[PDB]
Design a protein around this nucleic acid. Structure first.
Length: 245
RNA sequence: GGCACUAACCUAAGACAGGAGGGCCGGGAAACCUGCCUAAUCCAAUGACGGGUAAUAGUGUC
């Protein structure tokens, strides 16, 4: 359990460098949690006591380029919010449950639209934010272990700001053919390369501001087709068939 | 092109409800720091502080 690592004056250094210096001289590999500036300080968190003292050790073993020393200060602390937000096993358990109600057997279709507001989640004080990586991970895992044959996924209206955390879906739900991502915050068509592995037939993107980066439907259509060459329907419209040969 | 910074912009479900200033207990020779208190005054749910990058300039970096 957790430790806050304060680096005085840390503001003035390159995150990647500073962490490199530190990591180099550190007899343990560490992953900094919630690295953030705060006045002049840089600040981050680390998981355990072994890693924390190891970080303390680097104290006289590192110098900035102005030949001044860089101090690593350590203090036990509460787990960081991003860690406290992760779902507990019991909560995942109820999550599986709710997904099942939202699952149509005759169509192998999972409906996660506006998931955060599900009354059964609200009733059990389960906050499910699919933009959060731990959330997206637990959802996909549940899909990998209970319904890898998933055919149709609905993720509309979930304030998705990106798809980075979805990339492993290509492997988790390999036969996915239908995907609704409308009503989200996807900024650009490049979010699609993260999941371009999917052999989609149907896809919805409307409501995402990425759509407005096109001067016509034709370009918009071809842009999607680069990632999904067999795409048949888009935003509930039947597309012209793929150019022959 | 990547990555970082200043700007711009997005974010309270793209990390976050207080931030600056001031003060307190503790540690420390000091520097400085964990935690806490606080309308002198400034900023802040019309979102400060923190975070983020799909899009735009400026700078470094590989």
């Amino acid at each position: 359990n957790w430790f806050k690592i304060t680096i005085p004056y840390g503001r003035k250094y390159d995150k990647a460098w500073l962490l490199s210096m530190i990591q180099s001289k550190c007899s343990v590999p560490f992953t900094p949690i919630e690295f953030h500036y705060e006045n002049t300080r840089a600040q981050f968190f680390v998981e355990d006591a072994s890693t924390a003292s190891a970080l303390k050790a680097v104290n006289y073993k590192i110098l900035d380029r102005e030949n001044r020393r860089i101090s690593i200060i350590i203090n036990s602390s509460a787990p960081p919010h991003t860690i406290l937000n992760e779902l507990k096993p019991e909560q995942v358990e109820q999550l599986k449950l709710i997904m099942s109600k939202r699952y149509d057997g005759s169509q192998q279709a999972l409906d996660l639209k506006g998931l955060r507001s599900d009354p059964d989640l609200v009733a059990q004080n389960i906050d499910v934010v699919l933009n959060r990586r731990s959330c997206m991970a637990a959802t996909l895992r549940i899909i990998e272990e209970n319904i890898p044959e998933l055919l149709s996924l609905n993720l509309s209206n979930n304030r998705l700001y990106r798809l980075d955390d979805m990339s492993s879906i290509v492997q988790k739900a390999p036969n996915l053919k239908i995907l609704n991502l409308s009503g989200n915050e996807l900024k650009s068509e490049r979010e699609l390369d993260k999941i371009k592995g999917l052999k989609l037939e149907e896809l919805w993107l409307d409501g995402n501001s990425l759509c407005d980066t096109f001067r016509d439907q034709s370009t918009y259509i071809s842009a999607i087709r680069e990632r999904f060459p067999k795409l048949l329907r888009l935003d509930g419209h039947e597309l012209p068939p793929p150019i022959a040969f």
